[model samples]
Every structure is written in C-alpha cells, then in structure tokens.
Target: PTHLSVDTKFKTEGLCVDIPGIPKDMTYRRLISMMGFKMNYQVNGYPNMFITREEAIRHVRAWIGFDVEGCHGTNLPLQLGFSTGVNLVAVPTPLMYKGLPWNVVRIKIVQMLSDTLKNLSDRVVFVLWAHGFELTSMKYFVKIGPERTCCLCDRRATCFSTASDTYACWHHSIGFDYVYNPFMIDVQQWGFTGNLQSNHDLYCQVHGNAHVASCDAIMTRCLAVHECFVKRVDWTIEYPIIGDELKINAACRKVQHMVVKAALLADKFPVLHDIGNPKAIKCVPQADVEWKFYDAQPCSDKAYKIEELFYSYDKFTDGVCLFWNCNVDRYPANSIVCRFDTRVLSNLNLPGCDGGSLYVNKHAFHTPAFDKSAFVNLKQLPFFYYSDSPCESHGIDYVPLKSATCITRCNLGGAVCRHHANEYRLYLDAYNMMISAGFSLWVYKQFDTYNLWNTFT
Candidate 1:
C-alpha cells in the first residue's frame, strides 16, 4: 500500500534504492533535505550539523543498505548482499566456499565481508536492524565475536541520539550484544517494523525470492525508506537498549560461567536428560516426605578447568541438550567437576529432582525406566535443609512437607526418590539463579539492550 513515492530510479538488478518523496509525510526532496540534519550524519566525527537543511541534503553521497544470510546447513553466514541506493552487489560467499573446508571458509568469509564493507562508495551511510543478523554478520570482521566494540566511537556502546544530544559507541566492551554502530540507522530502534515479507509488488516483480541475500539487501533499503519517510518515527527514546552496570554485567557472566562449569564437571545433575523411555512414576504425598540435613565439607572436590565448552552460542549459559563426561560423536567429555548437591544431600534427593521424584515449581522431566531396579524408599532427608518455605523450629521444619508440590516416579533403578528432601533447598536456590540470571535468548533479544536479566523476579 505504501511506496517511497519520491522520484527515484532502480538500477538494473532492482535491489538498491534510487530517494526523494512526499505523501504520508515525505517527499524525495524532503528525504534528501532531512538527511542533511539526521543524527546519523553527526556520527564518526563528521562536521558540525548546524548548516541549512537544504544545502545539507547535498552533503552526503548515498544511502547504503545490506542484508546477510546464514546457512542452517553450515551454521555460518553464507552470503552478504548490499545495495547503495543506486548499485547492487552480493558477496561471492558460495563461490569462495566451493572447495574449502569450514575452518578455511569461516576465516575467508570474514575477510570477504570486510573487503566488501570497506568499499561501499564515498560518504555513504548504512541502515540495519536486529543483532546476529546483519549486525552479527557485519560484526564478524571484528573477529573477537561477542566482544566486538561499538562502531560509533569504537568504545562501549550505549543508546545515542542527536535528538537528546546523547552520544554513545556501538559496542559495549566485555559485553555481549550490547553495541551501537554510528554507520547504521537501526530501523527497529527507530520504532519501524514493516512486514519484511510483504512489499511493494513493483519491486517484488523484479526479484521475488525474499530469502536470497541480495534480494533482501535491496528490500532492506526499500523498507528502510518506507519506515523513516512514510511512518515518520521519532529517533529519541530513553535507553535505546536497557543494560547492566559494568560490574553487574561481569558478575552475571561469572555466575553463568560457574553453573556451566559445574554442569560440565559434575558426575550427576538434578536435571534429567531426554533419552525417551516413558514409564509411570508416582511420587509420595508432600507431608510424608521428610526434610533432613548436611555439611558443606563433602561437596568439595578437585575442580577441573572448563576448556571444552562449545563456542558460537553467544551466551555462556545453556542447559539445553548438555552431555557431560561422554566421548560420543566427536569431542571428549569434560573432566572431574563439582556437585554442591552430592556434597550435601544423598541419592534420595537426586533421582527425585531429575531422574524422577518431586521437582521445583513443577515442569517435570524425562526419566530412564530402570527395569532391573526396584523401589527403595529413602527415609533420610537432611535436617536444616534447603526449602521453598521457611518456618524452622528446633532442628527440623516438620509438617510443612505436607504442602503439595509436584512429584513424579523415576522407575530409575533402585533409587525410588518420590519427594525432595529439605537438603535440596540450597541446590534449588542455585538452580533458580541459573534460570533467572541466565537462561536462553528466548526472552531478551527483542531489545537493543535489556537490564532485565538480573532484574528478574
């Protein structure tokens, strides 16, 4: 329904923009006129932006836009496509990868993108949206991965604006995904969210495959113009991305690292893996499950170095499909690790948590049906133990176990753990921390920066 409406021309390939405009709120002349005063022009130490808007339109040469495509087959970026409002080119990633192995392909592709980016025409500006998409692909040239700094001032990135006179960099140092690029005007940050799939049938008539890197590269330009000129979005907002204070960021990472290393090194876990055999498991009534006790001394062991952790997931914490101390497929398993739960509680508390029994907040698990093993009820739960509720009197908090919590059966060998003993309270605290401070990108990626990770209840 909406087009740039400004007088323009598309070159031979039909992916690049050719700007001027007016209908909703813009004209091609106005597009040029506004570019003269855009906050983006002030980036990278350009000359003061106090000149007349008319003459300012002539100052910049062109608007360059790009899109990157990654192959699920290789899990690496496959190609980059770019258009300079007048010219279109797709980086020859497929040809470069034709004969080489992955290791060689990764290194060469980074170079190829960098080489392509360095030559985007004179006095050009870029437009982009979303991290690990264009941002990740563009950031690949930095080589350090998540540690890449801001593109604006080459320092830690923060929300920047000319509207508020707030200046900031593209990357936040020692931070992951918290960055800003002066060369780019992120459409989403500006409150633009056009249907990337749906577009002016006029441009789609030329190259309709939306999945192609080059096809998307041109469309990004098309949509880029649509949002800015047609929608007339405001550039000023309070924290472009919510972020953690430096120390909090570091500590949160450390906490995540601690749990990951712990999972890798430990011989056992309270979480169960999905090997896929189902059997009926019946956990005991809550009140009858006794709370027992322990000391921290038994939990200590020779801590191993966490060297074998996989890379490229971006975040250091992931509990998904983890396999510890195994030699399956390719890599060797991590060596001896620590278990705070094993050091404190006995087998009674465990099979209950993971292999089957009772669980915290009740999203239950995948347990192995131990056909050869028989049920042996564990009467001993630790005293002065970890608990969800607090009403400690004397040595034990009796009767509270009667409160209904989720319980499941583990047909798991002889360890018929039906309910969690109170000793699990501390380990539960640790588990809750992992779930809160560090889960997957399932929640936070929508923001430019979100401080909610540690702020979660």
Candidate 2:
C-alpha cells in the first residue's frame, strides 16, 4: 500500500544517511536507519561512525528501493550439519537494534520470502528458524500504568515485576499461524517442520544437528548478509559454512563468529558435549535416599564398607555413617551432619517426629511407609545428613511436625541437618571481617586515584 521512489545506482549497503524530504515516521526507512546507527556506530571507544547521518538515510533508501530476483537464495548452504537439503535458509543480518522488534522484522522477512518463493517455484521448501526466547522477549507486553509486567496472552511466565524501563511492550505480537499464510508464502504442509519444543526452547529439533541445527537463524542471516556484501567470494569454499563476518569498520573478524565456527567443527557445543554426558552424575547412592540417622565416621576395615546396620534394644547394634577423626583438626563451617534416629524412639515406644506423621503435642512420629529392604547399608552411605528445614528452633517454637519450619519435618528415610552452631558463627565473623577489609581498601584506593583519572578537570 505504501510507496516510495529510490535511486538504484548507489552502493549504500554499509552507509547511513537521513534524506531531507522523507517523513521521520516512514516504517522501513526508520527501522533500518536506527539499526544502521546502532550497528555502524554508538560503540564505546569507537572513534568514527562508519556511516554518518546522511549516509544512513542513503543506505535505507538503497535497501528499500533495490529490486532483487528470487528472494536472494544464492548461498543456501547446509546449516547446523543437517544432511537435509533446503531450498531456502535465511537468517537475520547482524544489525542489532536496541530491542528485538519482531513484528517489523517478521513481516519484512515474510514479505521478502513471499516474493522470493514466487520466483523459485511453489515446490521449494524453506526453513524458518529463530531462538525460542525471542518469542518471549517479543511477545511480553508491558508498560501501561499499574498493570503487572507480563504478557497478557502468555501462560508460562512464573514471575512478574512493575519495572517499565526494564521491560517494554512490543509494537506487535505475532500469531502462531502467521508463517502459514498461503498468499504471502506457499510453504507446503508436508515440508513444514515446526520445531516448537516449548515457547522457550532454543535447541535443535533434528537428531544429528549441531550448532547449525539449533536456533542459529541469526547466524545464518549474518552469513547471508555477508554474501550480499562480497559478491566476489565463493561461499562454497567454506563447506558447511560457519558464520564469520567483519565488524563495521573493524579490520579483524568478530571473536564470537570465529568462536562459533570453531565450536561447530570441533563438536564442542555444551548441551551436546560435557553437560549432557552421563558420567557427570556423581552421587553417594546409599546416602541419597532417606535416612533415620547418620554420623561422621570413616571405615577402618575395608571389608565392612558395605555392611548394613541393624536396630537393637538400648544401643547402636551396627555401624553408623559417621565422619572419621582427622589429624588436621580443621573446623569446616557447617561440615558437621547428624540425623534424628526415629527407629530408636520407635523401639522404646516413645513419641517421635517422622516423615508423614501428624503433629500431636508438638512431636512428629516416625510413621512413613517403611520398606526394610530399601534401607541402605549405613557403612556404604555418606556421613552427611539431608534435612528439609535446616534452621529454627522446634520445641520452644512448638514447631509442628508437618510444618515446613519444623526441625523434624524431614522425610522418614532422610535425616535432620544443620550447620555446626559454633563453626557457623565463627565463619560469619571471619566473612564479615574480610568483606569489611576489602571494602575499606577499595575505598582507600579509589580515593588515592581520584585526582589522577577524574573525568571532570
């Protein structure tokens, strides 16, 4: 519906300028101009903006005015290491706006794609990839008086704030079916693979996909933009093309682009490598479960390490999970661990606080579903005890056994735990002293250097 006249001869790709006659509110021009300024200028310690105000305007004019054939799919190389061939794969150009304005970008992209698809043919399938969190950042509408800071239509957000400056509303919120429009884009249903994991999932949907497989659409877009800039370079040289383009006016390639390329080739993405490895899971198996009690004692005999403890009348009949006596005499803060033995109380017919028991006279009874075989061998478990509620007084406070605040509120098979009172107090004293000393020294150093580097002469 909108119309504009543009000059095609000028190569205004990296330029930024403002024309004298154009309105300040023109959508495409304004968006691109702002992006140009942010991308080519406004960096810290950067001497000159590669494109001036006038240059920026000229660049936008060229971008809007130029006519391209077949949606510019010259470099539709394999992305994310996927063997699947795609007719078109476009990513966003590296022109970081102040915030992601999805409506503007999405509409512009779809429009371009529609025109490009027309030239290619209806049978050509394309891939639309975006990081999932972008949807949340794009859709989360905020800033309208006292309304809670949350997207009205969103359901999964766990927290909301009232800070408007921190969170701003989107100019537009796109729908789920926006990409499926038949008129603008002839995206076939059979080739349409929607990798919608969750509203916030950003991982690759394909099995053998790597960094390229993930939501690296922006990276792909950057590559596309670079290809546009250097018409002479052969894109096929970098097989399984990784994103690496020069920064505006900078001599060297951006560090991030280089890092990404290296990571992709090395098979070193964290989610697929170290973090996802099964060996990362290291836990004391016997101690992981619920426990009646535990002590700090190491095994003197190797054969008895796997031995189980039995409950007997009036005394401990077997080995306890206790910390061993150390020659170092080191006092670790909160290192001491202990668990309340409800079995002893049960054996003596005394009232006790247990896992799921109701509070009667402020005492929780040991009444959880007991499986004798499930109990771990005490010698095999760790000396540390796990408690649900580690702090606060119980008897004086009349802490209910079922209450989250109770000392005996731990699960039946688990143990009560807390920091060693003396050690914790001593640790706090040392922590406070160190923090204060650091703060004072920092203040003194700042005062000493005040006149030397103060900006105001």
Top TM-score model: 1
What would the per-residue lDDT of candidate 2 be over residues 1-457, giving only the tens digit for each residue?
Answer: 1112121122222121222233423332243333232223322222221223222221211111111111222232122211111122223231212222333434433344333332222211222222212211212221111222226433221122332222211211222112221110111111223432221122212222223333234222212222222122221222111111111102111211222222222222222111111222212222222223333222111112212322222122221121221101111111111112223321112211111111111111122212222222221111111122344534311222232211122323243223323223333344333222211000011112112122112
Q: CA RMSD for every model?
A: 23.2, 26.9
lDDT of 1 by residue, 1-457 (tens): 1222223321211112212122334333343333332333332432221222122122112234555555531244355555522211223331122333433433443333333332221222454433334543433332211222334555433322323433333221222221123244434333433445454333233334446565555565545443332233222211111222233334434433333332222222223221111321111113222212111111011112224323323222322222221111221121111112211221111112111211111111112111111111111111111122332333435232331221112111222132343434434454444334322111111111111122112
Candidate 2 is scored at a TM of 0.16
Residue-pair clash count for candidate 1: 26
- Give the C-alpha lDDT of model 2: 0.22
Can you tell me which runs of candidate 1 are displaced by over 4 Å?
1-60, 73-77, 84-121, 142-182, 199-207, 227-457
Per-model TM-score, in order, reads 0.24, 0.16
> Residue 3 of candidate 1: its Cα lDDT?
21
lDDT of 2 at 432: 36
